[PDB]
Design a protein around this ligand. Structure first.
Ligand SMILES: CCCCCCCC(O)C[C@H]1O[C@@](CO)(O[C@H]2O[C@H](CO)[C@@H](O)[C@H](O)[C@H]2O)[C@@H](O)[C@@H]1O
Length: 371
């Protein structure tokens, strides 16, 4: 089990970037979805463009040969897609290539082999049809969670890359709908609304960490998955965010001490949309997003470069479990206007696959959106 330790650090790194831009908006993204897409793309990149990408994903070529990295992803992806009898989890990569655009064989085979990618040739001259195919791919993979992902597509498009992840799990310790109650929340500084709050009194695998300055709760999903929640102490949100690390989570995953407690978890339906260019730029990956981008490993008759890279994720939480989807489109997609209002006691969460110890999703909940 390799590359998962890097994937984890990549998560926190990316999380911290989004976290220090605002502290009053909900956050949600899939490290796996983002890492798989850029890792696969690097196979067609060269020089700095290439090195910046793998390095920006928390990979150092001096510690692990590139061959093993692309290899670690191939196995990770194979393991994540292995059918689990108790939960649903799937990830897929798709390439939509322009008919008439000459490509590099080596690239087509590296992706299909290493990232189990699917290659589709489409006519981008028929923009409505090209979008439909892409959108049908994501909607099929996200089981209806994300439909009509791409609203507009450039006429001159010749290459498109999309990644999707889907997860649905049931709490081993579910809540009771009868115990859910409407509660007051300040939508703005001057008006409140009632939102559904789930409640349950019993034994929980809770604990408190000094280094993180917060309470840590573990919510197992039937299957090989788990959800860890972090409730920062007063004024210690920023502290939690910067202190989260792979090891810490490890020291907490090996604690079977459960105590009695009254859990209050709001019914949630959150989303997250981000143009990763600036954010990933902050991690060292900038060349591929510039004109000096070298992706001559994809095609030799087009000056490929990433102009935009939007990540979209949706997560629903209720009494019985969790359902979440994520998609990565390496092009333009509209941004949303998240509502900004902190209900004083925000929390961070991380959804993890016990089989590979990989972080499927990570977020921050400050607003009880029901969207
Ligand atoms: C790791 C723990 C994760 C649990 C996170 C719970 C977040 C909330 O739901 C917080 C929210 O619930 C209320 C309800 O009154 O607070 C109660 O529950 C929290 C649970 O931690 C208690 O600490 C509070 O004392 C309770 O009042 C909201 O007021 C609160 O903001």
């Amino acid at each position: 089990n390799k590359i998962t330790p890097n994937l984890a650090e990549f998560a926190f790194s990316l999380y911290r970037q989004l976290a220090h831009q605002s502290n009053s908006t909900n956050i949600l993204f899939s490290p796996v979805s983002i890492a798989a897409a850029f890792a696969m793309l690097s196979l067609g990149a060269k020089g700095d463009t290439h090195d910046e990408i793998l390095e920006g994903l928390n990979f150092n070529l001096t510690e692990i040969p590139e061959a093993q990295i692309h290899e670690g992803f191939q196995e990770l992806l194979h393991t994540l897609n292995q059918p689990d009898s108790q939960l649903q989890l799937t990830t897929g990569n798709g390439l939509f290539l322009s008919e008439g655009l000459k490509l590099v064989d080596k690239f087509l085979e590296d992706v299909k082999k290493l990232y189990h990618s699917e290659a589709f040739t489409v006519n981008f001259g028929d923009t409505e049809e090209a979008k439909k195919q892409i959108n049908d791919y994501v909607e099929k993979g996200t089981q209806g969670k994300i439909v009509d992902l791409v609203k507009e597509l450039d006429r001159d498009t010749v290459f498109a890359l999309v990644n999707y992840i889907f997860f649905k799990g049931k709490w081993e310790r579910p809540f009771e709908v009868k115990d859910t109650e409407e509660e007051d929340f300040h939508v703005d500084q001057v008006t409140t609304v009632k939102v559904p709050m789930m409640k349950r009194l019993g034994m929980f695998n809770i604990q408190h960490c000094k280094k993180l300055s917060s309470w840590v709760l573990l919510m197992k999903y039937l299957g090989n998955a788990t959800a860890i929640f972090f409730l920062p102490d007063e004024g210690k949100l920023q502290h939690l965010e910067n202190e989260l690390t792979h090891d810490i989570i490890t020291k907490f995953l090996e604690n079977e001490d459960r105590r009695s407690a009254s859990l209050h978890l709001p019914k949630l339906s959150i989303t997250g949309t981000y143009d990763l260019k600036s954010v990933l730029g902050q991690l060292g990956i900038t060349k591929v997003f510039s004109n000096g981008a070298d992706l001559s490993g994809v095609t030799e008759e087009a000056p490929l470069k990433l102009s935009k890279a939007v990540h979209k994720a949706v997560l629903t939480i209720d009494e019985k479990g969790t359902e979440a989807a994520g998609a990565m489109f390496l092009e333009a997609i509209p941004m949303s206007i998240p509502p900004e209002a902190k209900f004083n006691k925000p929390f961070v969460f991380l959804i993890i696959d016990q089989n590979t110890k990989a972080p499927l999703f990570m977020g921050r909940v400050v607003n009880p959106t029901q969207k």
